[model samples]
Each structure stands twice: as structure tokens, then as C-alpha cells.
Target: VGACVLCNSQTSLRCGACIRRPFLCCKCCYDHVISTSHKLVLSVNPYVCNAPGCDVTDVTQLYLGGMSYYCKSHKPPISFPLCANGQVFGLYKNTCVGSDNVTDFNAIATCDWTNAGDYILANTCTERLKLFAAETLKATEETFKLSYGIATVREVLSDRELHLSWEVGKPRPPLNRNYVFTGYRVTKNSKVQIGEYTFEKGAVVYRGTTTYKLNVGDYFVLTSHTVMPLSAPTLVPQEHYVRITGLYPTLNISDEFSSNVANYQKVGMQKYSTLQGPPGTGKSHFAIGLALYYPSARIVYTACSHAAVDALCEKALKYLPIDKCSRIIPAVECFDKFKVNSTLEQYVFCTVNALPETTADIVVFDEISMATNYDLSVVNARLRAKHYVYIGDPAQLPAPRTLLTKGTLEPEYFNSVCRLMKTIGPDMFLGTCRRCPAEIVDTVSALVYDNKLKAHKDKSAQCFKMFYKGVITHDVSSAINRPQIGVVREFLTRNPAWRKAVFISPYNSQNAVASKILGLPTQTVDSSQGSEYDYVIFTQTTETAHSCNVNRFNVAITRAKVGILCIMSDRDLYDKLQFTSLEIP
Candidate 1:
């Protein structure tokens, strides 16, 4: 028997079946099953085929049959031996060789830069590789090719060098090769598997400098540090500047008012700069001019309550030019006058609760006090206008809430006022009264200064216009001789006017006053917070309410706008509440 040739089990091998494609030697097939000594059949197939149309005779040069090996039988041998130590050359050698003959000739190669360095090469190994490629590509036609196969050649380095490369004309199959290997046959379907290869649109892999191919699923993920150069933080511009022009060229008014107005203009940029004046100080007129000035601006007119919001809306509508109103269309149709389909007056509604998400250039909350903080916040968030004028007075008593004491007012309850000041130093205060008699205005201002009637100058008051009254008792009897402290339930029945009137008590007496005097469902100075009223009847004494503290009294009495009927009779006690520079009732 012929001595069977073998190699290291770790090298390439075939199973006992010796299954191969195209053709199989018969003797080797029978010997495969009987070879028990070689536990793993180490089969070294020097088998190869030539590119079509190249040469039928040239194809035989690839096999180990002729000079490469002395074949004894035309019937076919039982098995093929290990290839010769040297490379097979034109049927001169008995067997194929190891890759020790493979060499590089990349230096002598050149490629066009425009086409991503498409290279050309020459040499025995590369020539064979090319031949195999032509055959593989030919088998696949235009769609697919035999992408991976072995080639037998003696690698001879060029005198200089030539570029070495490989290309697949078809999709690659799943490779079970080790990553330790340098060169890999890759195609459109090939992937550098480390994890489960999840392909995304635009996916790409790089094997060499000019060798990157796109996969199915990949996208560009822009990274900051890796992709972009470092940059410094953007500088903040100096905001506080003078933009005075036209009517008020250079705001030379009081610092408080001037600074506040300037800041308000800068921040709010509202068309209607609301001057929350007393009833007579022309808040309505201010609003009218505001509306006229920003004629292009949408008007949002709202009153204290659902009823007041409606009434105020009507009153404002009546005052605005009839042609303007008609041309603009009524606000009832569209609460958000700023909406694409809305007219300038579409948002002029009765109640603020119905305010649209879109806003007008001027949105006046008539009785700001009547609105809850939530309502105010909502309005604040939604109002896209240049200015949201709070027309009503803070003394009007805020959206009704429980009051604990008659004098003790909490600042938190005045969230609107607080928030407003944070932006534009205290939502613009309108100095002096327009509706109240001059004396009443003077008296209120004085009392406000002296902490009488529970009011005093605020930090922002120096900036406000001042008026003092020597005798504010033109109609003292109206305030003094009221038969009963009309509560909400009785007042609503007796005087419909009381329905609009709000009584502000301190938190301490809210329950008592709300239940007993039934006074407009008494709200505390704390809870009834912010926003003014037409008239206020302060029931509790300063001594009893505030224990002589001035801030508490100042906060409580300032709720009145036009009429202030404070019920106190003590001489020294009253004097303490009275203003020194101004007159009192």
C-alpha cells in the first residue's frame, strides 16, 4: 500500500466523507472511511480551477497531477499527499506550498486619487489571485460571485513594489475565521463582527486607508468632543440700556418709575403700559390710548368676575372707536385674537378665565385682584402680547380666599404682585386717584404714608404720583351711618352694587366676618391679597388687628380705590393711622 501523507490536525482538513464541489477523487473517498489512525483527516487540497477562456491547459498547471506529482493510475489514486515544499509552477511541482512564498509588491503600485486610489498590481501570487477573482466574478455574473477561495502561487517580490489588494464582486458569506488574521475577504454583506452585527442605514466599516464600505443600517451620529473643535461659552450682552425715543425722549422721570418703566418696556415690551390708578385716575383712558397707540395690537378686555369681565368688556368696546371695533370684529368669537383666524378684537372677552392660548398685543385684566394666582400664572404664561396690563387695583381684594386675621397679610398670598415685581419692579403703580374726589386721593395718599386707614408708601411709592387731601369727609355719613355691616349674602340682596364690591378682612377675622357681618364673604388681607377695589370698609382697629405694627396696617387699608370707609373712632389711635402731610376724613 502507498504510504498515506498527512499534516498537523490544526491545519486545513476534510471529514471522512471527503465531500467536495464539482469533482472528487474516488480512491480518496474509500480511504477516508478506513483511515482510523488519523483521527482528524488533514486534507490539503491543492485543487484549483482556471478562469474561463484563459486556457484549458493552463488550468492543469494549478493541479498537482503532472510534474507536481507522479500519478500511477489513470483510474485515480486512493488519496492525495501533502503538497510540495515549493509552489506549483506550470505543472512543474508535485504539490502546492505554504504562504512562505507569498510576498508584497505594494510600492510599485499606483492608483487614481479621484477614484479612491484604485490600484494595479503584478506578480505570481497576485496574478493567481486575480485569475481566481476573474473566475469567481465570472461565475457570479453581474449579481453575485464566488467571493472566497484559495489560490496556489509562488509570491515573488518585485524589484521595486506594487500595490496589493483584493475585491469581492458578490456579497460575503458568514466567515468563521479568526480576527487575528490581517486580510479578510469582505463584500457588501460582510461585517466586522464583535457584537451582534446590527446594521443600520449608512453603516460603514473600514479595513484600510481607502477601504470603507457601507452596510445596511448606519447613520451619522455627530459627537461634540470627537467631531467638533472646542468652543468658549457665548458672552451675555449688557441688557439695561436707554431706548427712550419720541414722546418720552430720555426717561427723566422718577428713578423708581423711570427705571421700572424702562425695565418694563425692555422686558414686557407691552403696547399698553397699564397705570393701575384709582377709579378716576383714568385707567380706562390709559387703556383707550394704549389700544389706539397699538391699533394693530389685539385687545383682550376682561373684568373682575364672569359678570364684571363681561361688563368691562362691553364698556371697553363701547369706548373703542366703533369703526375700529366693527372692523376688528368682536372678541367673543375668538378668545385668542392672535390666532391665525382671529381678528384684532377677537380676544376682548368678559372674563379672563376664558383667555385664549394665543394673546393680543394688549390684554388688560380689569380686576386683577379677582383672579387667582393660578389664573394669573396661566395668563402670564399664555400672554404673548407686548404688555399684559393689569388695570384693576390690588386693593380690590384678590380671588376670594379664607382670611385668618383682619390685619395679618402674608406676602406669599400676593404671588402675582411678587412675580410681577420680580420681572418689572412691582407691576406699574398708577399714582393719585382719578375717580375719587381730590381730597379722598390726598387723604388716601396721606393715610397711606402715615399708616392710617392701614396704608403707607411702598418701596416703589416714591416713584408714584402723590396727592394729599386735608378733609376727606365729603360723605363721611355714607361710611359712618351704614345700618349694618352688610355681609355678602345680605349685601347681594340689598344692594346689587355690593355684588361687585369686595370686603377685605385680615386672616384672623375671615371666618367671623364672613359668617357674622356677612360682608361680601369676608376675605383676609392676607388671602384677599393683591388687586384693589372701588371701596373698602376696614372693620378691625389697628391696635386690635396689627398690635400697632405699621406694615400690617399699610397692607390692609390700601385695598380701596375710589371710596374708603374705615370704621375706627379712637382719637390717638386714629391719629396714628392718619397721615401727617395729608388730610383725613
Candidate 2:
């Protein structure tokens, strides 16, 4: 029996159109109409009439006369396997197929359900496979065929501009994003691109010809690697779903960090696992410990921004040897942002505009919530790892400037993937924090985290807080707090040596005026995720209710290791949050 057209069930019913189509069963053929609108009939088999032109072309009209269909006209008015009309259509060697023949209905090769199933060689397998494809995933098929796979450079231009004359940017042609496309061992007809298929849209072409001249027949293949976001990950062959499920990893934990009870639970998780890393909970430390224990695993360390990645990479260097660790960025522009020393600088960091050149056994998504679901889906679709450990704090969301006239988009847009991920694994939480002082931690935890967060014992002796009053009954509609800006300006000038200080605001209007007047960079709470300072000079800029969003307040106060100097024109905010009073009223 042959497999059904749309499923892997055993069946014998065949559906032949222009070329041989997949064989289906009676019930399966009815179900197949959802994909192909084509209909069916009862028994249409001249069994393939031996005559090229049969008066009765509708094979469904035939019935069995014992086994062989008699030529009623040849006997009276018809013909078939032993046709009155001559055609070399079917040859039954021992029966009606030979000169030394007896007889049987051997012309039933293309019958619908009557002819049944046979060996794979009974029909044209190439035409069967190449001749038909799922109409459902045409765009998906088109994308994989065009943007990826190996190709011979039909023409190589003179100035090293290797020209690939095929369709380039068809995904405008809406490709999900660009990939770092590289072709290695370029010319030897050497099964060309068995190299890196990094994602990000750029090129790093490596070749076989260090000494040879550029010529035709030089082969190259693109590294394998997305478009409609999450749709791409779902595109993995349905069977591979089971295959991926089978490929979970094993880890050995001999150290204190890896053996920690909370973390040890993560090592056994397969598929989707998330770490709900609240602000300063040593989540990066947890992720670093995870990789160290899995010495046999190849892990990928990536985040939404370079700041987070660079911070994690710097911290990881303290624990990991350089050879097992590598840092990749998209381009040369990102090269200097790294904080690596001569040792890591010698072998670790490299740039690829797209997907990595290697396979990843584990992926550590630092600050996963900072990126949009589209970006997360792209990453999810591309990486085929045994475990995906997502790490992020969803308290403060990113509202990067993507629009023009109106205000920034809702933080919810950037907050989706992490939120959606919580549905899976039921997610894990890291409530303990070690970043801020007791005063800062207490105030923030009391307000936002329901007092679940902790400050290290040493942090209790580090309480420091004060206020700088600004007199602004400013423009409410435009969000301009001019008096707050002047107060911020005054505060910065008075503490000129507070070089490590960060000026944070809930409004861009206050930041623009203060940044222009004080001649220093000012940041919004949304942009202050992984940053900390000796002191944070915060401006509570407006009287609007949104100005006191609890998440904003939580992120702002926790960004200090030493002290906090609050400046605001809105006194009613204190009535609502009482953020100035910490661990007590």
C-alpha cells in the first residue's frame, strides 16, 4: 500500500491528473479537497484503454466482465486491454501483452481505486515528487528556495564583486530580517557552502582560491537559516517536531553555582524554559553558571542590545575560559563597544551580520523581553537547540522611538514574547536581587514587587537619599517641565564631579531641555535597563497619571548603587506612590 496524499496512512486509492499525484485512500481523498478543490468520481479506469482514442473516454463507465472488460463492440460495440483498435499502451507479456499470449485485463495501470498500489518503481517517482508540492506552503517553499541554498556564480565580475545573478531581495519579497550570509570553500566544486549560516543581512564570503584566478563554475552555497516571524519556527517539518523533542541535553554540575537548587531545576527542562529575572536578580550570573556546567554544550549568548550582551560577556569572562566562549556582533561598527582585554581580544570576538557559522546546543536569551515578538520568533525559528533559556525582566518595557508625530508605541509591543513565553513552562522567577542598596531595594520592592525582592546585608548600611525641589506648574499637554529642567541643571552644575551619574526622566521633554541646558546625555527609564550609576538624578517631569507608572518608578529608583537625588515638580506623585519613603513610611 502507498501512503495517503496528505498524511502517512496506508492507502491504495490513486488520484492521477496531468502527472501522477499522491495516492490517497477513499476517506483521505475527501479530506484532500481542502487543499485541492478538484473533485472525484466512482471508478474511472479504461484501466487505461489500449486505444489512444476510445469512443468511451470516460473510464468510470466500465464494469468487470469476470476480470477482463470485453469489447462489446469488438465483440459487439466496444474495446479495452485487448482493444479492437491498435495502440501500444499496455503490454501484458504472458496474457494480452504478447504475440504468444493468452489474455487478461492488463491495461488497468492508471485505474483510480481499482488498480490499487504497487512498488515505488511502478510509476515515475521524479514526476511524483518533483511533479507535485504542497500548495499550502508555496511562499515558505519559495523563500527557502530563493534566499538560501547553494548556487554557482553564473558570472564573477572583475573587481571581486562576485555577482549572484539570481533573485536577491525578493522578500520585500518581505524577508523576516537579514542574515550574515557567507560562502566558504568557494570554487573546488567542493560541495560549497558547508559553513556558517549566521542571521543578519550581510556578507562574509570565504573561498577556496587563495592562489587561483576567478572563473566560472566556481560554486558557493548560502548558509542555511526567516520572514513572518513566529510562522517560520512552526514551519519545521511536522515530523521533526518529534525529532527535536528527542534531542534534549545532559549536563554535569559539580560547582556551587550550578548545583544551586533553583538553577539545578532548569538543567532538566527541555524545549521552552523561561527565567523571570526581576531587576538585579543575578539572572546573568545564573545563565553564565548554566553554560559553565554544560562543558560539552555549544551555547549562544545573545540579547536585544549590545549593552546587555557586552555586560553579560564581561561578567562571563570572569568565569569562563576564552576558547569555549566567543562574542559575535553584526558589524565593524559594534566592534569597539566590547570591553574585552588582550586575551579575549586575541581569539574571542568576531562579527557576522547574521546567523552564527556554527550549531548552538543551548541559547541564552538575555533581556529577552526587550525585543519584539517578531525578533524573538526569528531567533526561535532559526535556532534548533536542545534547551532555550529565556532571561528577562518585564517590569520596565522598551518604547524605542519608532514613530514620528505621536508618542512612542505601547511597552506591550516589546513586552509580548516574554509574556507569551510565560504560558509555556509556567515560567520561573528570580525574586532575590543583589544589585541595589537596602534603601533603594526596599523602596522599589515595596512598591513594585510586593516586597518579594531582597538586598544583600551589606546594602543595609548603604542607605542614601535626598530630594531637589523644582518649581514647575509646567505645560501639561506638551509634557514640558521647564522648572524641573532648571533644577536638574542646577543639581548637575553643583555636583560637577558626579561624572558617573545618570540623568533619568519619565518624559523626553524634560530630558531634551535638561540635556541641552546641562550639555550632557539624559536618558528615559525605558532606555536604562542594564545601566547603574553612583547616583541617579531623576526628574519627575509631569502631573499626568502616566508620569507615575509603577513600572517606570520601579526601574528609575533601582538604577543606583550609591545614592538617589529625586527632582520633581509634581508633588501629587508622592501622595500616590510615596517613593521617597523606603522600607517604611
lDDT by residue (284-303, candidate 1, tens digit) is 55555444444445666655
lDDT of 2 at 466: 31
| lDDT score of residue 559 within candidate 2 | 81
Off by over 4 Å in 1: 1-276, 322-347, 403-407, 411-413, 418-424, 437-439, 447-566, 569-573, 576-585
Can you give the lDDT of residue 167 in candidate 1? 31
lDDT of each: 0.35, 0.48
Candidate 1 accuracy as TM-score: 0.35
| Backbone clash count, each prediction separately | 56, 22
Tens-digit lDDT track for model 2 on 412-445? Answer: 3343344444334326677766677677776767
All candidates: TM-score = 0.35, 0.51
